[PDB]
């Protein structure tokens, strides 16, 4: 009842080494490019900031 | 493995032991019709082959 624990813990340490472990180049590309892609979806919150609270002032005030 | 055609089993054994810090039971060479001496290498039973296989890259 104890050995499938041994199986999975050795099974993990198998496939950790088989993976390719990226280096300073691809990390760089998806890093900067996808923080940029994040902020593409990101400033949208600053525009519901700029809009939907002042029009909620329009909502409640009238 | 694929091995250099000039090699003895003695040399292969010694190489396999040296490179992979391992230890061999027996080497069992043939020559492929292609030209590349193949080598089947039985590791001693203290060692697992799949474990070293994962170490060297292959699986």
């Amino acid at each position: 009842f104890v050995e499938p624990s041994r199986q999975f813990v050795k099974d993990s340490i198998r496939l950790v080494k088989r993976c390719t472990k990226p280096d300073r180049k691809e990390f760089q590309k998806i890093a900067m490019a996808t923080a940029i892609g994040f902020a593409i979806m990101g400033f949208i919150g600053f525009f519901v900031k700029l809009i939907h609270i002042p029009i909620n002032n329009i909502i409640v005030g009238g | 493995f694929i091995v250099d055609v000039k090699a003895n089993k003695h040399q292969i054994k010694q190489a396999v032991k040296k490179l992979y810090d391992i230890d061999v039971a027996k080497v069992n060479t043939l020559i492929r019709p292609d030209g590349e001496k193949k080598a089947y290498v039985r590791l001693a039973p203290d060692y697992d082959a799949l474990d070293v296989a994962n170490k060297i890259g292959i699986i």
Partner: protein
């Protein structure tokens, strides 16, 4: 089940992409116009029923889309997302059969539209439930159909990330950005109008003297967001993209062509667990829905195995809650990996029949030994791929460097896979 409703329901479809196939930057024009729309789409509604709570699922709901009692963002892309997900489920899970004729994939998009619009109608009815009920419904569908068209014109069209995931990403950029510069505050013991922004920790230098105790409030701010919190939030983003690039390479002699090597990869995140985290989330959401039926027939004694312990003090007053919460998180994501892969694709037979179906054979052995070539990767790269996300979200909670936690780690993981998807078609 498919053969009857799908041929009749064809009303008002979308136009498939033209013969202007290869281009670099008008691709980005078709992105940016949709981003103009979700400049605009997050804007105020036309009905004056000013209800007190904004939305009821406003926080989790807000995390998905943040125009709660707000704009034409329609409280979420939750129609398109949920309707896409269970559609791909019931295609992959063989409760309903697979359509692979192009008529069936086209009507599959049609039924996608169908369940999406029906779910929009469901959300409309369920939020509105006075006498002013007219024309809200007309607005919502018009603004449901618009998000539909913009998403399906950014899958067969430009689409690289998705329509969906980059909408979520940019709206999340905005939800950080309203916290970044914050103009208003309706009027604590000192210091109005500065709550965890960097503008807050730049206006704070303009007001107060004794800049040491201006640093201390900037870096160890507790009740509001913190900038140490923001460093940890950035740090988590960096590590998680360190772990997205964990992938297993498998080279493939294509069949019947000499030596092209388009190596099939297996990334550890393994659909980025948009099942498996939401597997971890929504069961603990459905009871905290149904504790409301526990008030009659609670936030106390049921909470000790329900939630995280919320405390930055690692030795906070109950180790039982901490241990059981972390063990449940790890085991839940691992278990829902090892159960999840069997339905939404990419299990052993799934990969095998897709590769035979696209004529790609492993070099080492015979074609239907490919299963045994890769069956010793996919479950572990499910299970570990489950496991070291949830423990990773442990590091999203154990250290408060997360704007929203676990979920933010994983929705930006959605974005990161999303970038790959968009790039794919270049």
């Amino acid at each position: 089940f498919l053969e009857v409703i799908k041929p009749f329901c064809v009303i008002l479809p979308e136009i498939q992409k033209p013969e202007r196939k290869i281009q670099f930057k008008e691709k980005v024009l078709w992105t940016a116009i949709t981003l103009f729309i979700f400049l605009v789409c997050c804007q105020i509604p036309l009905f004056g029923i000013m209800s007190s709570d904004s939305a009821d699922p406003f926080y989790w709901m807000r995390v998905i889309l943040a125009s709660n009692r707000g704009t034409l963002m329609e409280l979420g892309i939750s129609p398109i997302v949920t309707s896409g997900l269970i559609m791909q489920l019931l295609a992959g899970a063989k409760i309903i059969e697979v359509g692979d004729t192009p008529k069936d994939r086209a009507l599959f998009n049609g039924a996608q539209k169908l369940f999406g619009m029906i779910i929009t109608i469901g959300q409309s009815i369920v939020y509105v439930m006075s006498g002013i009920c007219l024309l809200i419904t007309i607005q919502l569908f018009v603004a449901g159909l618009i998000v539909l068209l913009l998403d399906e014109l950014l899958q067969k069209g430009y689409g690289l990330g998705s329509g969906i995931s980059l909408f979520i990403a940019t709206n999340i950029c905005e939800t950080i950005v309203w916290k970044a510069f914050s103009p208003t505050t309706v009027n604590t013991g000192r210091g109005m109008e500065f709550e965890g922004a960097i503008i807050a920790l730049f206006h704070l230098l303009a007001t107060r003297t004794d800049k040491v105790r201006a640093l201390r409030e900037a870096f160890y701010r507790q009740n509001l967001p913190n900038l140490m919190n923001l460093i940890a939030t950035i740090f988590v983003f960096a590590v998680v993209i360190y772990f997205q690039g964990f992938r297993v390479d498998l080279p493939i002699k294509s069949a019947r062509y000499r030596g092209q090597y388009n190596t099939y990869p297996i990334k550890l995140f393994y659909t980025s667990n948009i099942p498996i985290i939401l597997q971890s989330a929504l069961v603990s959401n459905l009871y905290v829905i149904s504790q409301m039926l526990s008030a009659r027939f609670p936030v106390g004694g049921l909470c000790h195995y329900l939630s995280p312990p919320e405390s930055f003090g690692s030795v906070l007053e109950d180790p039982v809650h901490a241990v059981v919460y972390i063990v449940f998180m790890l085991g839940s994501c691992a278990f829902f990996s090892k159960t999840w892969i069997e339905v939404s694709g990419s299990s052993a037979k799934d990969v095998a029949k897709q590769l035979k179906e696209q004529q790609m054979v492993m070099r080492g052995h015979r074609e239907t030994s490919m299963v045994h070539e890769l069956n010793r990767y996919i479950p572990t790269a499910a299970a570990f791929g489950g496991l070291c996300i949830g423990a990773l979200s442990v590091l999203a909670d154990f250290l408060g460097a997360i704007g929203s936690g676990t979920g933010i780690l994983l929705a930006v993981t959605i974005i990161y896979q999303y970038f790959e998807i968009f790039v794919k078609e270049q």
